[PDB]
Amino acid sequence: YSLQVTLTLVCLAGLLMLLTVFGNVLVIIAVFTSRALKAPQNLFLVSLASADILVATLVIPFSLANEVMGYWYFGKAWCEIYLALDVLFCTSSIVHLCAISLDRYWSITQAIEYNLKRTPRRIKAIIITVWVISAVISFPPPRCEINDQKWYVISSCIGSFFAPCLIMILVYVRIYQIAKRRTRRWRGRQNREKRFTFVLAVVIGVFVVCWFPFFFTYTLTAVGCSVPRTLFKFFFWFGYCNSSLNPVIYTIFNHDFRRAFKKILC
């Protein structure tokens, strides 16, 4: 492997881990320290931040060690569990994003009924269901490689990314259509149209641009195309990289969160 570039790589990934943990814990605090943030829907954000902190703190070094060291030095008793835990954490983050999107959609449409049914008990039930589905989809599993079973890989990739991606796309397309239909003083309204298009396109695009390449390229390898070469590692690294940005997308566009972060910083 590289002799000085390894220092550049290890340096860069430590930077990544730092940024991730920082932002996610900032959220967990703001959310836990802000009275205006005492809403049942922010439990999803808290769970997502906790999952991302766990992944960044523990899974990254083993993958940072791998590639860098160049081989799996830790106990072979760990690859079969390291890979599964990585899969579980990433799928849990994705499912948390999808559940947050679904809650937003159900709050925007059928607002009265869903507000009647927005109990913290239901919020916790959804959180536990997400975690249990993440555990179920990760229950099946000098070197360590990811699983290569075609059927298992295809099923896991499909049910862990493609379904939540489609659900998020549909829900946010519906939300965009609703906002546009309700869009029609006038300068403020037209400014608001532009603002919402943005906040949604960023949310719709960061997740896709960060995960679709890996999962696409992942299946491509599984289906047999396997054209991805080295770029897969870059696509792989884009995915962890996506987690660090994840809290920013979901918290910056909310004033109650902005002001809480400003208070915390100052």
What residue ranges bind ligand A1CIU (CB under 6 A)? Answer: 86-87, 90-91, 146, 156-157, 160, 214, 236, 239-240
- What is the nearest approach in angstroms of ligand A1CIU to the Cβ of residue 127? 19
| Extended beta strands in the chain, E state | none
When the beta carbons of 88 and 171 are compared against ligand A1CIU, the nearer one is 88
Contact between 100 and 45 (Cβ < 8 Å): yes
Nearest Cα to Cα of residue 52 among 26, 78, 71, 83? 26
Residue 37 DSSP label: G
If the CB atoms of residues 228 and 239 are measured against ligand A1CIU, the closer one turns out to be 239
Cβ nearer to ligand A1CIU, comparing 200 with 248: 248
Q: How far is the CB of 147 from ligand A1CIU (least distance, A)?
A: 7
The amino acid occupying position 113 is E
169 Cβ neighbours under 8 A, 6+ residues apart: 204
Give me the least distance between CB of 11 and ligand A1CIU, in Å please: 20
Q: How far is the CB of 68 from ligand A1CIU (least distance, A)?
A: 16
> Shortest Cβ contact with ligand A1CIU: which residue?
239
**Pick 41 or 155: Cβ nearer ligand A1CIU:** 155
- From the CB of 12, what's the least distance to ligand A1CIU, in Å? 16
> What is the DSSP annotation of 73-141?
-S-GGGHHHHHHHHHHHHHHHHHHHHHHHHHHHHHHSSHHHHHHT--HHHHHHHHHHHHHHHHHHHS--
- 23 or 213, CB closer to ligand A1CIU? 213
- Give the angle 228-231-235 at the CA atoms, nearest 5°: 100
Question: Which residues touch 221 (CB under 8 Å, ≥6 apart)?
Answer: 228, 232
Nearest approach, Cβ of 38 to ligand A1CIU (angstroms)? Answer: 32
How far is it, in rounded angstroms, from Cα 40 to Cα 118?
7
Of the two residues 66 and 251, which places its CB atom closer to ligand A1CIU in the complex? 66
